[PDB]
Amino acid sequence: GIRLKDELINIKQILEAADIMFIYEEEKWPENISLLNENILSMCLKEAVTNVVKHSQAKTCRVDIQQLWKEVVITVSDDGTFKGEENSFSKGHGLLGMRERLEFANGSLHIDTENGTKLTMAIPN
Ligand SMILES: Nc1ncnc2c1ncn2[C@@H]1O[C@H](COP(=O)(O)OP(=O)(O)OP(=O)(O)O)[C@@H](O)[C@H]1O
Ligand SMILES: [Mg+2]
């Protein structure tokens, strides 16, 4: 029930309070996304950033939110170190939670944990 523009403000506050530099510049903002898919993305954006704050030990977090072809794509990257096991998608927790909720919406969640942690989340639009 959170607009994505409002969630952006929440994550700026959370990252600043955690002494993590937030890097965001508006580019290709979605011109129309369903209120459902927008709200799913707000929830996933919040969780991606909760994870940065709780686990990463990052000094920087970069967020991109772009309409690309038939998807809205959100990427959240940080320059800390990934703390999870080889398979970090477990029942009852946010990575698998976000992936399952996105996939139900015919979207996707990918993760790269080489240079810190980067989450790419996409949903139809
Ligand atoms: N940005 C990150 N940086 C470092 N480690 C991370 C990051 N995101 C996730 N992890 C690791 O992946 C694990 C699983 O993440 P997940 O969000 O599924 O669970 P959680 O945050 O521990 O619990 P919950 O999401 O239920 O509050 C984390 O416990 C942590 O070890
Ligand atoms: Mg989590």
What ranges do the domains of the chain cover? 1-125
115 CA to centre of ligand 1 in angstroms: 16
Query: Alpha-carbon distance 19 to 15, whole Å?
Result: 6
Distances in Å between the alpha carbon of 96 and those of 41, 48, 50, 90, 110? 15, 12, 15, 6, 11
- Its CATH architecture, for the domain 1-125, is 2-Layer Sandwich (3.30)
Q: What does this entry list as its resolution, in Å?
A: 1.7
- Contact (CB, 8 A) for 6 and 22: no
- Contact (CB, 8 A) for 98 and 44: yes
Query: Residue 101, CB half-sphere, CA atoms under 13 Å: how many?
Result: 20
Q: Count the helices and strands in the chain (H runs, E runs).
A: 3, 5
Structure tokens at 5: 């523009």
Fill in the DSSP letter of residue 108.
E
Pocket flag, ligand 1, residue 88 (CB < 6 Å): yes
Q: How far apart are the first and last CA of the chain?
A: 18
Query: Alpha-carbon distance 47 to 68, whole Å?
Result: 22
Pocket flag, ligand 1, residue 2 (CB < 6 Å): no
- Contact (CB, 8 A) for 15 and 23: no
